[PDB]
Amino acid sequence: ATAVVRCRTRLARRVVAAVGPDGLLPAPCESRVLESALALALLTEERAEADATARLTAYLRTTLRTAPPDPFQCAVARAVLGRKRLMFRTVLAALGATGFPAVPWEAYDTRPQQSWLHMEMKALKVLAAHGTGHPDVVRDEDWRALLPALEPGPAWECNNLAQLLALLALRHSPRHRPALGDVLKHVAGRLRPDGGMPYIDGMTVFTTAAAGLALSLLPAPPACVTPMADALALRRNPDGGYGFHSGVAQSDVEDTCYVLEFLRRAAPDRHRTAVAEAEGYLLALRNPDGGFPTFARGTSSEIAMTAAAASALAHDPDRREEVDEAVRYVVRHQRPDGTFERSWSRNATNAVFRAVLALTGVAAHGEERRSRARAAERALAHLAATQNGDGGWGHAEAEPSDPISTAYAVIALARGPRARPGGPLDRALAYLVERQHPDGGYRSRPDQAGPRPLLYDVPALADVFVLLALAHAT
């Protein structure tokens, strides 16, 4: 067939072969400078694990010399070797690279429903209190939030950044020091082969669900979608949502939407109850303005999360009213230049493909069809306007192309007009065909941020989103 179908067949063989007997696509996270530097400071100060401190040191010098990250991580690494503005300032101040923010102590107090950030902010408040010479400011309720960091085994919520920050604060408290020695050995045992510390354990639920959705969109889905659907359903949280990895109690809208869309196609009867629980999770999260937050109701709705929820809930005609209110939220927030806004992904094309899917996926007629089509046209027009010469897109309009940013654009463009020769979609598919590597896969710069806008690299996502693009476009 075409070179695109040939490329799609080769990539699908690779994704299927990577799924394990347990029905999961392994998706480890690469080492990151910020957490490696925090692990280096924690172990150095506790005078523990000399083998890991040397490997962490060699990793940091090598990474700065051959592949330096954002300026913030470089300064964090350099300080160790030799609300979000408040969090990053306090981190650098805790390492001695700047002064502590002269803010009221309540600025570090955040809502508990964002569990990861809540523990992170509490640890930095403790570090700021001790760092400025006011240890007596720390309340008992502040210490109690960091208690999960002293539990043995993998990091609480698979978040190495959260545990490292909480441990750096807990070592200042003699009441919590008895439990510090054991976890220090667990922390030092997490080093990747390159001597670095990953941000998270992985993203296996997110990756398996996105891979299964792509496989279920092929002309003939492989049989492995059933054990993949089983492995996802048995990992659901009590509230019906899904975390990004095994053992993540904080469900989120993005992970739930990918699982829900996958289960809807590959096992709507086999996992009828899991499907119903995920829809109930999304609807209990919905905001009165029609949008959807990321984690907890009462926090700000987001375009990407609202569009993803609109597409996921659109399969049930019982939910036509909530789905239409969500799509209207998307139209209401389209920028004057046709874009929407970044979020968990750092490229512009991500929110574009989520919005276009909701705009062209939900059945609509009359005045609403006109309004939704015009919003979809302006979004697809923004893609064609910012397309690079080689046929791909980057993180931003002037950035070099990468397969993942281009994959998002292809999914959006696949809902537009037919691919004519030389058209924007045709050249995008040709860019993806050229960038396929002999082993059948793709290697791309990462686009996931956490904590925003700090990037982290889960390499297995390159193959998954490119396959999702090729399945949508063929």
| Residues in CB range of 71: below 8 A, 6 or more apart | none
Distance separating alpha carbons of residues 119 and 412, to the nearest angstrom:
37
Identify whether the C-beta of residue 461 lies closer than 8 Å to the C-beta of residue 27. Answer: yes
Beta partners for residue 302, in sequence order: 292
What's the rounded Cα separation, in Å, for the pair 423 and 69? 35
Reported as half-sphere exposure (CB side, CA atoms, 13 A), residue 439 has a value of 8
203 and 233 in contact (C-beta within 8 Å)?
no
Q: Are 160 and 200 in contact (CB under 8 A)?
A: yes
Architecture of domain 3-27+203-473: Alpha/alpha barrel (1.50)
Q: Please provide the DSSP assignment of 152-211 as one string.
A: SSSPGGGBHHHHHHHHHHHTT-TTTGGGHHHHHHHHHTT--TTS-EESBSB-HHHHHHHH
Q: Label residue 365 exposed, middle or buried (CB < 10 Å: 0-12, 13-18, 19+).
A: exposed
Determine the Cα–Cα distance for residues 282 and 149; give it in Å rounded to an integer.
29
Match 């006109």 to its residue by tokens. 370
The closest alpha carbon to 73, from 63, 86, 62, 84, belongs to 63
Which residue, 417, 395, 414, 422, is CA-closest to 469? 414
Residues 6+ apart with CB under 8 A from 356: 376, 379, 380, 411, 412, 415
CA nearest to 79, candidates 95, 57, 94, 56:
95
Q: How many angstroms is the resolution?
A: 2.4
Q: Which residue(s) pair with 200 in the sheet? A: 159
Q: How far is the C-alpha of 45 from the C-alpha of 49, rounded, in Å?
A: 11
- The dihedral through the CA atoms of 219, 224, 228, 229 has a sign that is positive
Cα distance between residue 156 and residue 445, in whole Å: 27
By DSSP bridging, strand 31-32 and strand 197-198 are antiparallel
Q: At what angle do helices 180-188 and 33-45 cross, to 10 degrees?
A: 140
Sequence-ordered list of residues with C-beta below 8 angstroms from that of 90, at least 6 positions apart, any chain: 100, 101, 108, 124, 127, 128
Q: After which residues is the chain broken (C to N over 2.5 A)?
A: 82
SS3 279: helix
Euclidean distance between CA atoms 52 and 48, whole angstroms: 9
Other C-beta atoms closer than 10 Å to the C-beta of 78 total 14
User: How buried is residue 104: exposed, middle or buried, by Cβ count under 10 Å (0-12/13-18/19+)?
Assistant: exposed
| CA–CA distance, 100 with 92 (Å, rounded to integer) | 8
User: Comparing C-alpha atoms, which of 417, 394, 449, 461 is closest to residue 214?
Assistant: 461
Q: Identify the H or E element spanning 457.
A: none
How many other C-beta atoms can be found within 10 angstroms of the C-beta atom of residue 266?
20
C-alpha dist (Å) from residue 416 to 221, 261, 380: 24, 21, 7
- Do the bridges between strand 455-456 and strand 448-449 make them parallel or antiparallel, or are there none, so unpaired? antiparallel
Domain boundaries, the chain: 3-27+203-473, 32-198
Q: How many residues does the chain have?
A: 474
Q: How far apart are CA 254 and CA 9, in angstroms?
A: 27
DSSP state of 297: B
Taking the CA atoms of residue 306, residue 308, residue 310 and residue 315 in that order, the dihedral angle to the nearest 10 degrees is -160
Cβ neighbours of residue 29 closer than 8 Å, sequence gap 6 or more: 198, 199, 200, 201, 202, 203, 456, 457, 458
Give the 3-state DSSP-derived string for 201-238, with helices as H, strands as E and coil as C: CECHHHHHHHHHHHHHCCCCCCCCHHHHHHHHHCCCCC
Q: Which long-range contacts (CB under 8 A, 24 or more apart) does 438-442 make?
A: 439/14, 440/10, 440/11, 440/13, 440/14, 441/11, 441/14, 442/11, 442/403, 442/466
Neighbours of 140 (CB within 10 A): 7
CB 170 within 8 A of CB 146: yes
Burial class for 175, CB neighbours closer than 10 Å (0-12, 13-18, 19+): exposed
Dihedrals phi, psi of 145, to nearest 5 degrees: -75, -25
Amino acid at 185: K
- Rounded Cα gap, residues 346 and 452, in angstroms: 9
In angstroms, rounded to a whole number, what is the distance separating the alpha carbons of residues 200 and 35? 10
Nearest to 163 by CA among 151, 177, 149, 153: 149
Tokens representing residue 324 in the block: 């239409």
Cβ neighbors of 261 (< 8 A, separation 6 or more) are 213, 311, 312
Alpha carbons 180 and 155: distance in angstroms, whole number: 14
